[PDB]
Chain A
Amino acid sequence: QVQLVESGGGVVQPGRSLRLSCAASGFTFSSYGMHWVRQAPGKGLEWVAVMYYDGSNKDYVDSVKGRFTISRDNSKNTLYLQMNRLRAEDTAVYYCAREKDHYDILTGYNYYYGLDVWGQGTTVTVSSASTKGPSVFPLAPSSKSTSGGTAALGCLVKDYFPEPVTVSWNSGALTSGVHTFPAVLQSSGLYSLSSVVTVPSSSLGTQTYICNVNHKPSNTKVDKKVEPKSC
């Protein structure tokens, strides 16, 4: 039952603000130090702040100093991260972790045992972009997309915000040969991905291939049909 639940995450604009929250249950919150850690989309783990019970003792990573503020309500067993003046680079998944320490009264020295238990994470995404359904374009199979007795085809899920989209082929029937690439943020601020499938060259004309883009954030469900190019 020792666990930590984050919330507060969501889409927010450069310059505006957000108070992430981290809610401890299953343990004596007051006695543990607490930490936020972020992980940007492509990249690895980055510590961002710590706070101890006192809480005279507080610290932050350089890039968030003055801009970010940590606090805890011991009565509600909650930890907070007031993020102000958000930049693009704060786009990240925000875990909260606890640390157990121990004070030796006889010496006045302190011992530290590290981040044992972590939260599930809350996504924070800083964009000036507005919600937008994807335009779905076919990647039509042709003579220039056939290697021997096998074709490839797909669907270009382009210009949507924010993540994510689910792509499906033939409403669930086709899942063999299918490759849905992770999305890439464009210079426009919007996402784009492609789902692709490899099918037998003979089976073109016979079977129909339909891709099923669902974008929940914008209430969008598009089903493009993929038609072989010829000349």
Chain B
Amino acid sequence: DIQMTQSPSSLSASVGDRVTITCRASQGIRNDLGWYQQKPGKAPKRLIYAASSLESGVPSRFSGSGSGTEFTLTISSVQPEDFVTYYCLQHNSNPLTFGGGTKVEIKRTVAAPSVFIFPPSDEQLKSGTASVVCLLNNFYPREAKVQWKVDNALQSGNSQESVTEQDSKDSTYSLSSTLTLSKADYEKHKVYACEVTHQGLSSPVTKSFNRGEC
């Protein structure tokens, strides 16, 4: 099996920047490499083939280079349409293997999340479970950290996070961390806090409520 290591996984550029996704191979796959672009929700489209040979009707910003074991895709001037995911594929041996993929996100200044907390609705409690959500809103970069605290006690294994695609207007991300416990579990503990930690935050932001319906 030929392992394809794609570097980097995610990268941050601005329209104009030279971008270089590289993609290494664990054996000599010769010149049998091709670069695909996948747009969100759409089927991948092939850009470079035979390592360096540009496909028909692909802008000349894209260029391929490499041989044997080192392979490099290069956009000279990233436009708005290029901030998507890219894969190398090798077709030198079965099983055909891809690189892990490279997301090209649109760079911007650091912006701390504005944090928000929401207690579980009355009609949810009726049904026999309590979902508490914490909302980190309009931040950058994407890597943030939500630490649920209940009765000043760390929580683990019991919550789930979800993240938006990079916002097209302002290039920020938002994430939500939903803590779900049974009504029974939920009615035991008074205070529910949501500790957020992010690079635009010298000090962590904690939003908390303690079963006051307010």
Contact = CB atoms under 8 A, between A and B. Distances in A.
Contacts of B16: none
Contact of B44 (A45, A114, A182, A230): A45
A192 B178 contact: yes
A35 interface: yes
B149 interface: no
B164 A181 contact: yes
Interface stretch (A79-87, A124-132, A151-159, A207-215): A151-159
B184 interface: no
B164 A179 contact: yes
B57 interface: no
Contact of B91 (A46, A112, A182, A194): A112
Interface string B85-114: 101010100111110110000000000001
Nearest to A93: B43
Contact of A50 (B85, B94, B178): B94
A145 B214 contact: no
Interface string A57-87: 0010110000000000000000000000000
B46 A147 contact: no
Given A142-B119, A179-B164, A229-B214, A99 B43 contact: no
B89 A139 contact: no
Chain A interface size, under 10 / 10 to 19 / 20 to 34 / 35 or more: 35 or more
Interface string A136-155: 01111011110100101110
A169 B123 CA distance: 20
A150 B114 CA distance: 10
Contact of A114 (B34, B38, B87): B34
Nearest to A63: B95
A121 B43 contact: yes
B48 to A, nearest CB: 10
Contacts of A46: 98
Interface string A107-120: 00000111110111
Interface stretch (B19-27, B66-74, B76-84, B130-138): B130-138
Interface in B161-212: 161-164, 174-176, 178, 180, 207-209, 212
Most chain B CB within 10 A, of A47, A180, A192, is at A47
Contacts of A119: 43
Nearest to B117: A144
Given A114-B46, A142-B214, A181-B164, A198 B137 contact: yes
Nearest to B208: A144
Interface of B: 32, 34, 36, 38, 43-46, 49-50, 55, 85, 87, 89, 91, 94-98, 100-101, 114-121, 123-124, 127, 131, 133, 135, 137, 160-164, 174-176, 178, 180, 207-209, 212-214
Which 6 residue pairs across A and B have the least CB separation, nearest first? A231-B214, A139-B118, A47-B96, A44-B101, A181-B162, A137-B121
